[PDB]
Amino acid sequence: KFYIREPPHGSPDWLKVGLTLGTSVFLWIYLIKQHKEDVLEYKRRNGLE
Amino acid sequence: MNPIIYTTLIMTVMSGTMLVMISSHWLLIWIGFEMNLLAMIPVLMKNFNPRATEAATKYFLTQATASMMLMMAIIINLLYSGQWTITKMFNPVAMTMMTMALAMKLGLSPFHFWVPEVTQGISLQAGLLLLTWQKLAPLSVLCQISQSINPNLMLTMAMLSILIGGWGGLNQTQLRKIMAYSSIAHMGWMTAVLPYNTTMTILNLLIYITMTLAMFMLLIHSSATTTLSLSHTWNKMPVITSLMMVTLLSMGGLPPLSGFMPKWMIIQEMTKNESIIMPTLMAMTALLNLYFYMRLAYSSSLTMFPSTNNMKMKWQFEHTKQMKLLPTMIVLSTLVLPMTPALSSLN
Amino acid sequence: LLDLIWLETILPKTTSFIQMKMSIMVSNQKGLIKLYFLSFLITIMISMTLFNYHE
Amino acid sequence: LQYGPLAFVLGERTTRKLTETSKVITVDGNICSGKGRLAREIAEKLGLRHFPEAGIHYADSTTGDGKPLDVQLSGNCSLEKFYDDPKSNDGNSYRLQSWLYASRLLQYADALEHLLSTGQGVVLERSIYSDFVFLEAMYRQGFIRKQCVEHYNEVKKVTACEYLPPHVVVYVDVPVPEIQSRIQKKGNPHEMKITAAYLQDIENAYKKTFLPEMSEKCEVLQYSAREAEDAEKVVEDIEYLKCDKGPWPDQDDRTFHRLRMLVQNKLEVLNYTTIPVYLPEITIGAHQSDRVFQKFTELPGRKYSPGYNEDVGDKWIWLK
Amino acid sequence: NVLQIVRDHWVHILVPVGFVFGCYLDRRSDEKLTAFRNKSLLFKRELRPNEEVTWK
Amino acid sequence: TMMSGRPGRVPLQFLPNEARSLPPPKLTDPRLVYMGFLGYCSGLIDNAIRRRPVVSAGLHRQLLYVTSFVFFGYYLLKRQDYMYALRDHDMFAYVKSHPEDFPEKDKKTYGEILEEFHPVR
Amino acid sequence: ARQWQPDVEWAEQFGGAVMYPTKETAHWKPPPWNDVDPPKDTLV
Amino acid sequence: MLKIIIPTTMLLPMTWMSKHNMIWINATVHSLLISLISLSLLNQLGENSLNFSLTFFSDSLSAPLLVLTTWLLPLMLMASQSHLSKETTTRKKLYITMLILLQLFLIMTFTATELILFYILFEATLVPTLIIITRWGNQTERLNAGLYFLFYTLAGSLPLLVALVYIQNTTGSLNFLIIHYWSHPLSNSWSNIFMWLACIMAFMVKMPLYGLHLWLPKAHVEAPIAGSMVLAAVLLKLGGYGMMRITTILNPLTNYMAYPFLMLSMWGMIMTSSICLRQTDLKSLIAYSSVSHMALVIVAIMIQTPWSFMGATALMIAHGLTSSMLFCLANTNYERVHSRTMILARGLQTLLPLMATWWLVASLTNLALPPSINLIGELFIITASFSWSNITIILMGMNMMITALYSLYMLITTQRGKYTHHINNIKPSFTRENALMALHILPLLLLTLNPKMILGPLY
Amino acid sequence: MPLVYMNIIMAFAIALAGLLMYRSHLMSSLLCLEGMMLSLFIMSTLIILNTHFTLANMMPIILLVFAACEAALGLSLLVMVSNTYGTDYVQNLNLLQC
Numbered sequence A: 001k002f003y004i005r006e007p008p009h010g011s012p013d014w015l016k017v018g019l020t021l022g023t024s025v026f027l028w029i030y031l032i033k034q035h036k037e038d039v040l041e042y043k044r045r046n047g048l049e
Numbered sequence B: 001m002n003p004i005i006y007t008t009l010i011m012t013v014m015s016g017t018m019l020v021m022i023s024s025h026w027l028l029i030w031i032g033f034e035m036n037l038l039a040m041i042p043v044l045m046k047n048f049n050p051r052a053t054e055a056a057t058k059y060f061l062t063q064a065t066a067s068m069m070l071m072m073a074i075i076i077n078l079l080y081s082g083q084w085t086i087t088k089m090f091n092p093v094a095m096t097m098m099t100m101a102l103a104m105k106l107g108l109s110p111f112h113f114w115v116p117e118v119t120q121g122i123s124l125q126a127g128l129l130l131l132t133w134q135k136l137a138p139l140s141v142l143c144q145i146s147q148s149i150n151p152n153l154m155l156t157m158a159m160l161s162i163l164i165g166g167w168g169g170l171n172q173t174q175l176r177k178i179m180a181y182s183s184i185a186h187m188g189w190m191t192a193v194l195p196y197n198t199t200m201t202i203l204n205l206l207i208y209i210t211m212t213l214a215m216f217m218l219l220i221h222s223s224a225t226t227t228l229s230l231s232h233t234w235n236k237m238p239v240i241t242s243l244m245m246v247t248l249l250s251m252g253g254l255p256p257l258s259g260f261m262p263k264w265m266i267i268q269e270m271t272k273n274e275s276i277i278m279p280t281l282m283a284m285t286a287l288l289n290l291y292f293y294m295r296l297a298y299s300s301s302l303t304m305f306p307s308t309n310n311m312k313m314k315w316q317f318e319h320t321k322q323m324k325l326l327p328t329m330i331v332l333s334t335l336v337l338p339m340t341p342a343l344s345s346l347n
Numbered sequence C: 001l002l003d004l005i006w007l008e009t010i011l012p013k014t015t016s017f018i019q020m021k022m023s024i025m026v027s028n029q030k031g032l033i034k035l036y037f038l039s040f041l042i043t044i045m046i047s048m049t050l051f052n053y054h055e
Numbered sequence D: 001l002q003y004g005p006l007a008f009v010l011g012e013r014t015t016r017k018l019t020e021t022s023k024v025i026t027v028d029g030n031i032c033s034g035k036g037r038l039a040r041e042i043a044e045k046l047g048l049r050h051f052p053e054a055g056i057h058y059a060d061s062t063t064g065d066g067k068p069l070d071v072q073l074s075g076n077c078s079l080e081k082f083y084d085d086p087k088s089n090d091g092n093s094y095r096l097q098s099w100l101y102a103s104r105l106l107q108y109a110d111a112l113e114h115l116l117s118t119g120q121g122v123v124l125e126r127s128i129y130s131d132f133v134f135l136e137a138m139y140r141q142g143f144i145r146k147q148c149v150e151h152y153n154e155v156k157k158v159t160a161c162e163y164l165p166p167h168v169v170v171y172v173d174v175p176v177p178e179i180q181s182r183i184q185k186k187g188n189p190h191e192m193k194i195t196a197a198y199l200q201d202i203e204n205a206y207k208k209t210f211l212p213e214m215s216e217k218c219e220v221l222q223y224s225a226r227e228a229e230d231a232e233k234v235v236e237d238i239e240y241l242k243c244d245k246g247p248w249p250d251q252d253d254r255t256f257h258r259l260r261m262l263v264q265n266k267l268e269v270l271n272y273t274t275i276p277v278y279l280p281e282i283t284i285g286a287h288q289s290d291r292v293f294q295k296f297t298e299l300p301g302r303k304y305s306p307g308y309n310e311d312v313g314d315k316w317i318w319l320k
Numbered sequence E: 001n002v003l004q005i006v007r008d009h010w011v012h013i014l015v016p017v018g019f020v021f022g023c024y025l026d027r028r029s030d031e032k033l034t035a036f037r038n039k040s041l042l043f044k045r046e047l048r049p050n051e052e053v054t055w056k
Numbered sequence F: 001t002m003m004s005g006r007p008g009r010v011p012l013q014f015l016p017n018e019a020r021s022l023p024p025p026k027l028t029d030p031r032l033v034y035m036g037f038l039g040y041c042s043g044l045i046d047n048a049i050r051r052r053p054v055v056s057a058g059l060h061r062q063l064l065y066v067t068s069f070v071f072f073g074y075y076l077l078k079r080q081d082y083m084y085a086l087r088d089h090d091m092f093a094y095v096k097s098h099p100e101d102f103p104e105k106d107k108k109t110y111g112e113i114l115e116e117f118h119p120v121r
Numbered sequence G: 001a002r003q004w005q006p007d008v009e010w011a012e013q014f015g016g017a018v019m020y021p022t023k024e025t026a027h028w029k030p031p032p033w034n035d036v037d038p039p040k041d042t043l044v
Numbered sequence H: 001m002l003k004i005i006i007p008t009t010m011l012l013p014m015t016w017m018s019k020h021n022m023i024w025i026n027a028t029v030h031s032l033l034i035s036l037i038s039l040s041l042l043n044q045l046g047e048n049s050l051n052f053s054l055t056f057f058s059d060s061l062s063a064p065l066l067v068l069t070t071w072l073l074p075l076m077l078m079a080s081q082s083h084l085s086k087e088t089t090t091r092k093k094l095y096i097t098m099l100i101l102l103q104l105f106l107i108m109t110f111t112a113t114e115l116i117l118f119y120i121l122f123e124a125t126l127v128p129t130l131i132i133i134t135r136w137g138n139q140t141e142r143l144n145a146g147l148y149f150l151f152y153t154l155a156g157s158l159p160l161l162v163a164l165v166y167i168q169n170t171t172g173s174l175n176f177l178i179i180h181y182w183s184h185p186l187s188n189s190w191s192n193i194f195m196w197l198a199c200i201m202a203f204m205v206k207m208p209l210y211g212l213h214l215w216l217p218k219a220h221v222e223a224p225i226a227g228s229m230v231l232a233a234v235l236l237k238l239g240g241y242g243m244m245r246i247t248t249i250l251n252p253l254t255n256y257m258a259y260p261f262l263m264l265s266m267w268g269m270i271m272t273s274s275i276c277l278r279q280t281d282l283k284s285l286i287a288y289s290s291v292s293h294m295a296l297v298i299v300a301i302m303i304q305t306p307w308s309f310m311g312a313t314a315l316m317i318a319h320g321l322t323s324s325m326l327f328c329l330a331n332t333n334y335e336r337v338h339s340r341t342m343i344l345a346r347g348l349q350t351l352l353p354l355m356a357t358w359w360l361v362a363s364l365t366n367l368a369l370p371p372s373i374n375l376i377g378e379l380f381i382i383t384a385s386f387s388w389s390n391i392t393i394i395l396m397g398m399n400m401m402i403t404a405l406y407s408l409y410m411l412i413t414t415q416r417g418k419y420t421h422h423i424n425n426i427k428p429s430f431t432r433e434n435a436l437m438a439l440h441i442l443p444l445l446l447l448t449l450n451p452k453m454i455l456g457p458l459y
Numbered sequence I: 001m002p003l004v005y006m007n008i009i010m011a012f013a014i015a016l017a018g019l020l021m022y023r024s025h026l027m028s029s030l031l032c033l034e035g036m037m038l039s040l041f042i043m044s045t046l047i048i049l050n051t052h053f054t055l056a057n058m059m060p061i062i063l064l065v066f067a068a069c070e071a072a073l074g075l076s077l078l079v080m081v082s083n084t085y086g087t088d089y090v091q092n093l094n095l096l097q098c
């Protein structure tokens, strides 16, 4: 074991873990939506379909 | 120094360089330079010792002289045309005065003498700010007036800077002086391509800033300011030594490391307009920078220097304050060559 | 005579000697501001007399 | 929130936690004295935290678990070999002296950090300011060379200047023959080899250098063997002192902030102990250094950070 | 006993899947250079009555 | 600099509306894959520096690294493609606008072009 | 039997103020470990 | 051709994800499998090269070199797992990572269709070799050697880059196919002369030339066994491949410009053959033999005739294999005796008979014994030079004699005579060393069965 | 150009040379800097008044303001130098070399 408090505890800091996971998910869905909007806009501007 | 005072001085330095880089008036640019110098002087003296005091004195004297000649150039340009806008600046005498003033502010040869000394006197944190951030404003002013720059003077000063940095770096054992001479050589490299294309100047500035940042934060992590003190960290943090060797290889300019991208590009940009001798001279001279980087790498990681007994105690303790942006800086300093074409986003 | 003496003397050893001499000459400054500020004055005069005189 | 510049910016200051009972207390005495029991009693009566004397394996009790490590991995020196063979040709004497000085420096940093963070005082059993008496005793007896004491002086000059001296210094004065009698009566087979000249040199260095120097910055309370048992009297003398001469009342909040940022992060505390000075006693070759470092890394809880060692039962690693 | 053997020898498929991915990548690269398929003056040829491409 | 001064150029846009007429890079673009690989390498280096199990210390941190690198790389690639397209468009427009400076020369065949022969001997 | 590694004699070349010591720079002293020169006994 | 490149980039993490005692087995097995896969590029069209994509193409000159590199990696792994037994797991993995990165860079170098990419990878090969030499050497000179091995290269190759970009500013492209199809003669002018020098000097110093060979003995002596293998077998052939690729544009300036280089190559081949006789070291003799053979290859490339090109390719492959085998044979004795002196351990035939047989076969293949591919390349080069000038044979003939002499000299000094009477730690040869020798020697005979695979595109 | 402009420019050049000569002291160089600033102020105000640039009239004043800052800065450093050495001589600033 450790005689010190071990600032990294036996369980992770769930606040920071949740913040990081939420940030990753938000960025991924934002990228997906942005790509969809961009391809739709390109198709509309070029008149392809 | 109080943390509030320190952060407000840093913010004032950044505000001064922002004022330089966003102003269309010559007087506002001069005001930004003055604010930058005034708020930068105490930052060097955060840790008080006679060496820091004399480094601050030399820096202040050099910057004050440069500002004086810069203002004289502005006044002469106003005299020969009632224009305040930062523009072509047709007058040759005023343009020469401004070129010399900005060269002294940057540290180009033969105005390089203050760079190795001041870096030696100040702390690594202070030194990092001086070598990285204090180059944006003069380079921006040079970029705005690049079309009027006389190629002969600028190229002569750039070649002198490269030669002097390469030769001076060969002799130093202190890490801060090595970094200062490397900075002089890099300033020469970026200044060389300025009359032809400022996009390459900006790209070289970005890559040099990334490499110098990674170098300095690695040096701060293993608190060593000399070659022998750096020869001990293999017995404490070998990963730091390996990353440091890779970063030194990148700074040397070896491919496929990122440090090869600016030089190559610059050479290409100088070949598009019938400049052949000068890039060859620059490459053969930067071989010297590579040599002393290689000597540092030999002393640091590729060999194992004898250690001390008390180092055993250091084995039981961890580094408390951890720099967040160090891994990103290392990665951008080494593995970013295949994304070379993205430089088109810089114009 | 050829490999260990003269081929070493011409390309590598001469280069090392010249670079060492130049490094010693460049990096030997006493640190006094007076001397290299006088050098700054000389540089300013040379630049203002040798570059912009012809336009 | 871990203390730092931001924690200092809003809220937390140091001078608002000092309750006039900080009183960094250092108890000094010659070999085999009653200084340890006196220090424990003073700490108990005054309500301060007692710091036992920094041994060879003091740093082992602060990291990981309190169990000491092997002598090869920590210290690389022994007191018994110094007592049996003080003039050994492997440089054990100065290696032990330097390791003990570094351990005392670490203990002083720990005590200062505790006092600044909590406000409760500390009672040490020997400080870095009185560690040089053993060095002078070794040098005068020919146990160590002059280059060793020069290296020690350089390390002390670059290290001890960053801290503050103890508020009050307590000295227990015991005559040399009484010390020899107590050593003989103790029973440890190695301490019976301590010559009288060694103890005499220790006490001479003490009385001639340490106390006169500390009298200019602190308050010195010399005692005797007979009056060192009634700890109530010494507690009364301590609590009826006039603390106005040292630099402690001349400390501002910024100075305390800098000192607190320095005492934690023990790497900066021990930075200047391993200066690149190549003395045969302390210098270690590359091969032995590599072997010993590899051996230390293979310890059960020393491979990774103190919270990322699955060997010692740490869980949820992949989410920390 | 699949657990231990799999957890110890899962590294023995990285090279084969790398080879398969390399073949797949070559084909993808291949599909982008069909600008002159069945248009060379030397190999121009009328199609079979069921085939649609000369080569893939 | 050549493209710093250009008519109808908003200063700090980083992505003009005119750039929306170009096809966006695919999400499986090899450059985006390299950006994600760079993020993974940065995460591994972060794990190594902090003295943590390099491969599997923090999965959320590595995921955030990769996501941030990919997110920045998408827009960087978009801007780079826009800049190259603009350069090509300007070059073609200038070539068309000045036919005298880029004339169509004759197309001679090798049967009438006389090239001197260098024997190897 | 084992790979050669630097010793004290090889390490001491990088201990001076500068490499390539000439007669003029032979009296140059290396800077103090902490960048604090000792106070001068200035009689004022 | 990503089916070969990707498996190497997968060899990297599987090496980094293997068990502590299973790294060598996995590395050897999968490197052998990758070499077997790369053996499929030998099917070459007689008309033109195989153009897989816009970046990678394979010719009749590239395929034997690729096969040689992919076959080399397992041999280096086998030879490296003897002196690295006491190393830690992380450093062993780092060594294997350096070897894998070097192979990957070589593979991408030999097939790059664009000259700037070829230069980038041909210079990227410098970092792993330098790290290996300066980190896993044995003596204190290795650092110096590394410095030489770096700068002698870079000072010769930095101008080339400029020339390359200059060409791209003049012709408009650097793709090899466009360069070959749109090639135009070079007029006689100082500008074109310096362009020729810039394009040639890098590959000249990478061979190396006689006057620029000083780095090779240092690099090949102070490097570990695998470093010596990769330096003497494939890393030398980079200059020859580059010259054979770049001489297309240099005509007709080459005929005037090749006289000093041809003279240097011939006289230096004679000089290095003579130097091999009076050598007290064992690895230096092999290094100077490599120098002589590469000088012959330089002459072949410079005279620029199809027979010379065929002989150059054959000699390159044969010399790579033979020098690798000789270095391994010397390394076994060095591990036995812990010294590099040639006359220290004598009469080893009475103690190690099979190793004596391997030494005899390697020495026989070193002195161009018929019908081995060494003699095929040497004889083609000699015939081409004789057509170039009837006097050259004299020099060539001289070299041949000297070659045989020093080869047999070594074979007589280390194997024949009586033992030293005081080296009692010469254990019997392991299975690993004999297997390494057999895997070195059998491909030479198998290739001399079917030589058209290693005769290059001019066949 | 009239003789007044050339006299002001010559004064600025003389002040710049005097700053660059560095005889013995440090206050003398600060005086040279202040003289250069005064010459710049005079030149700027003469140019502004001659061409009737109305809005530019506050330009010199701002100049003067920053001049004060520079002077203050220099004086501060001088004090520290004195407190380190008891004398403002520039010969003592030689702890750092190139």
Ligand SMILES: CCCCCCCCCCCCCCCCCC(=O)OC[C@H](COP(=O)([O-])OCC(O)COP(=O)([O-])OC[C@@H](COC(=O)CCCCCCCCCCCCCCCCC)OC(=O)CCCCCCCCCCCCCCCCC)OC(=O)CCCCCCCCCCCCCCCCC
Binding pocket: B238, B239, B242, B243, B245, B246, B256, B257, B301, B302, B334, B335, D297, E014, E017, F041, F044, F045, F048, F052, F053, F054, F055, H009, H013, H016, H017, H090, H091, H094, H097, H101, H127, H128, H131, H135
């Ligand atoms: C072109 C193709 C790609 C190539 C690109 C380049 C290579 C990749 C990118 C590089 C960056 C990524 C990794 C670097 C950071 C890692 C840090 C580290 O130290 O690693 C140790 C770490 C072992 O540590 P551990 O396990 O925690 O426990 C042992 C302790 O750490 C005990 O540790 P220790 O500290 O006690 O050990 C001492 C050691 C510790 O020091 C080191 O280990 C050196 C660290 C490497 C330097 C980082 C350089 C930064 C990146 C620049 C790369 C330049 C590339 C250009 C080519 C030139 C190369 C110089 O120090 C020494 O031994 C000193 C010897 C001096 C040697 C000088 C050479 C140093 C430079 C070598 C750089 C080579 C390139 C990186 C290759 C990968 C290396 C991990 O290695 C790993 O386990 C991770 C390696 C990567 C894992 C890949 C797995 C991927 C996912 C698995 C599945 C695969 C796909 C599955 C799907 C299949 C479909 C079904």
Ligand SMILES: CCCCCCCCCCCCCCCCC[C@@H](O)O[C@H](CO[C@H](O)CCCCCCCCCCCCCCC)COP(=O)(O)OCC[N+](C)(C)C
Binding pocket: B202, B203, B206, B207, B210, B332, B336, B339, B340, B341, B342, B343, B345, B346, B347, F001, F004, F010, F011, F012, F013, F014, F076
């Ligand atoms: C070498 C690695 C460098 C990396 C740099 C840091 C990367 C992360 C930082 C986040 C990037 C955001 C910064 C800017 C985004 C919004 C601001 C935007 O409006 O800026 C505009 C456009 O943004 C910038 O101009 C370009 C930013 C793109 C930076 C990437 C270039 C890196 C070099 C290529 C190597 C590959 C690196 C890959 C990185 C992962 C400015 O337009 P403009 O007012 O008209 O410019 C005037 C000055 N000029 C004309 C002389 C240039």
Ligand SMILES: CCCCCCCC/C=C\CCCCCCCC(=O)O[C@H](COC(=O)CCCCCCC/C=C/CCCCCCCC)COP(=O)(O)OCCN
Binding pocket: B274, B275, B276, B277, B280, H151, H152, H153, H155, H156, H159, H162, H163, H166, H191, H192, H194, H195, H197, H198, H201, H205, H212
């Ligand atoms: C191991 C050490 C080996 C060192 C080898 C280094 C020497 C390499 C040979 C010279 C390299 C530089 C040549 C330049 C690169 C080619 C570019 C080019 O061809 O452009 C020429 C320009 O050519 C030059 O400018 C060359 C100038 C050379 C300056 C540097 C000299 C280096 C040393 C000279 C002697 C080296 C040659 C022999 C060395 C042998 C090895 C020791 C044409 O000029 P344009 O702008 O197009 O205008 C013409 C139409 N009006």
Ligand SMILES: Nc1ncnc2c1ncn2[C@@H]1O[C@H](COP(=O)(O)OP(=O)(O)O)[C@@H](O)[C@H]1O
Binding pocket: D030, D031, D032, D033, D034, D035, D036, D053, D079, D096, D097, D100, D101, D131, D134, D135, D191
């Ligand atoms: N700097 C030092 N050098 C050598 N020995 C030391 C040093 N510091 C402490 N010691 C040893 O620590 C031992 C225990 O200390 P001491 O106070 O005399 O006994 P006790 O703990 O019973 O009171 C002593 O034998 C002393 O020699």
